[PDB]
Structure formats: C-alpha cells, structure tokens
Amino acid sequence: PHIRYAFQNDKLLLQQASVGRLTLVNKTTILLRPMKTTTVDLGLYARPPEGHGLMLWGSTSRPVTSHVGIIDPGYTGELRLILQNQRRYNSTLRPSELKIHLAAFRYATPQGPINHPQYPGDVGLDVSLPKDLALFPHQTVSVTLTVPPPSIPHHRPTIFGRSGLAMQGILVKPCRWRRGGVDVSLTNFSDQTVFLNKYRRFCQLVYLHKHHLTSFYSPHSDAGVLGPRSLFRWASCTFEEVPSLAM
Numbered sequence: 001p002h003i004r005y006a007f008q009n010d011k012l013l014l015q016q017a018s019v020g021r022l023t024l025v026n027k028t029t030i031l032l033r034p035m036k037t038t039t040v041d042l043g044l045y046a047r048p049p050e051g052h053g054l055m056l057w058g059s060t061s062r063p064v065t066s067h068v069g070i071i072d073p074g075y076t077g078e079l080r081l082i083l084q085n086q087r088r089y090n091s092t093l094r095p096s097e098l099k100i101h102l103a104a105f106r107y108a109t110p111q112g113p114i115n116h117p118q119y120p121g122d123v124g125l126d127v128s129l130p131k132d133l134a135l136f137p138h139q140t141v142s143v144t145l146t147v148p149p150p151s152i153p154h155h156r157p158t159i160f161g162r163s164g165l166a167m168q169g170i171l172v173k174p175c176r177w178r179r180g181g182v183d184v185s186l187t188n189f190s191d192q193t194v195f196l197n198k199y200r201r202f203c204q205l206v207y208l209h210k211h212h213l214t215s216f217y218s219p220h221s222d223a224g225v226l227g228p229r230s231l232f233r234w235a236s237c238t239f240e241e242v243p244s245l246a247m
C-alpha cells in the first residue's frame with residue numbers, strides 16, 4: 001500500500017521517510033508557556049491506503065507531553081501536533097529536541113457508553129463518561145471502564161484522546177482496553193479547574209489489528225504511543241510524495 005503525502009514547512013526538517021514511518025524534526029527553538037496549549041502547524045498532508053488510518057505522535061526527552069493523534073481516512077486538511085508543558089515555568093525545545101512521527105495502521109469498526117463513528121469511515125467511537133469528574137490544574141484524574149466493548153476477532157480495543165479536549169489542556173494517556181477493564185487517566189495541564197459531567201464524550205475507542213501490538217523493539221516499532229508494555233508496530237507502507245495534496 002502507498003501513503004500519499006505533501007510536506008512544506010521551512011521551520012521543520014524531514015529527517016527520513018523509511019520502513020513505513022515519516023519523521024520530522026524542529027529546526028528552530030519551540031517555546032512552551034506554562035498552563036497553555038502549544039500547537040505546531042506541520043504543513044503536512046496525507047491520505048492512507050484503503051483499510052488504514054494514520055497515527056501522529058511527538059517524542060522528546062524534555063519535560064513536554066504531546067497528544068497522540070488518530071488521523072481519519074477521509075481527512076484532507078493540514079495535520080497539527082498539540083503539546084503541553086509539564087512544568088510550571090517556560091520550557092523550550094531547542095533545535096532537534098522534538099521528533100514528530102507519522103505512520104499507518106489497519107483498523108476495524110463495529111456497528112452509551114459507546115457511540116457510532118461521527119462520519120463515514122472514521123476510525124474511533126466516542127465513549128461516554130460514567131460519572132461527573134472535577135479536574136484541578138496540573139493534576140491527574142483516573143476513571144475505570146469495566147463493561148466490555150464489542151468483540152472483534154483479530155483486533156484489539158484501545159483508548160486514545162480526542163483533539164478538542166487536548167486543545168483545552170486535557171490529555172488522555174493512551175492504553176489497551178484489556179479483558180479485565182481499563183483505568184483511563186486524564187491530566188489537566190491548564191490553569192483552570194475543568195468539570196466533565198456524566199455522559200460527556202471524554203475519549204475514543206479504536207480497534208487496531210493485532211499485528212499492530214507487539215513486545216519487540218523493531219525498526220517497525222516504537223515505545224512512544226501506548227507506552228512500554230505494548231509497543232505500536234506500524235504497517236509496512238511506502239510513502240509517496242504528491243505535492244498537489246498541499247493546500
């Protein structure tokens with residue numbers, strides 16, 4: 001399969017597009033104010049092959065957390081990375097300290113608490129909050145989902161955040177939804193208490209094909225997505241530059 005893309009941004013360098021993953025790195029210093037969202041407009045456009053979505057994620061050893069972005073197959077706008085400052089003062093990413101990754105995966109879609117996809121073809125299904133929560137500034141809050149989602153053979157249910165909460169300072173730490181049930185953690189990086197009532201959509205349910213979860217560290221895998229216990233392994237695709245995709 002081919003991923004077709006276009007990229008144009010003088011503040012970012014394309015490091016490589018190899019073994020199914022594109023990596024960009026920052027050429028300029030990136031300033032992060034405390035308590036506020038930082039967005040990086042990537043100048044990057046892409047369309048996945050049939051049956052696949054795309055995954056967007058950032059990686060750094062500085063004290064900065066990035067949203068893990070689930071990219072729908074019908075999306076034809078510009079991709080953005082959303083970052084949050086872990087400290088209570090300015091943090092900077094000096095040239096080359098931020099890596100930005102994009103790669104594809106096969107997924108499946110079933111037919112409260114679980115809602116149908118927003119648009120034809122969307123990868124994720126919104127999951128509703130089972131109780132009111134109060135999220136205080138610079139604090140983490142955890143919630144349990146225990147009632148099983150729909151079973152889909154050869155796929156693995158996983159939870160990821162949505163981009164609109166992320167823009168408000170609320171990140172979800174992505175995690176597998178395992179047989180026992182899943183503890184979903186939300187951190188508020190903003191300066192204000194955020195109230196999320198019962199029935200609010202707070203995260204999304206994604207069914208990755210099981211090939212996309214591994215324990216081996218590979219050319220084809222990375223600990224940066226779901227963390228260390230289950231590595232994300234992206235599809236073996238080829239990137240192909242189609243400059244007219246750029247808007």
Ligand SMILES: O=c1ccn([C@H]2C[C@H](O)[C@@H](COP(=O)(O)O)O2)c(=O)[nH]1
Binds near residue numbers: 067068069072080163
């Ligand atoms: O980190 C992200 C996450 C999402 N999106 C784009 C592609 C998605 O299809 C669309 C909506 O994503 P959600 O609101 O559903 O997370 O925005 C990004 O550009 N960057």
Ligand SMILES: O=C([O-])[C@H](O)C=C([O-])O
Binds near residue numbers: 073075122
């Ligand atoms: O909001 C989205 O999920 C995305 O924007 C969907 C399409 O198809 O364009």
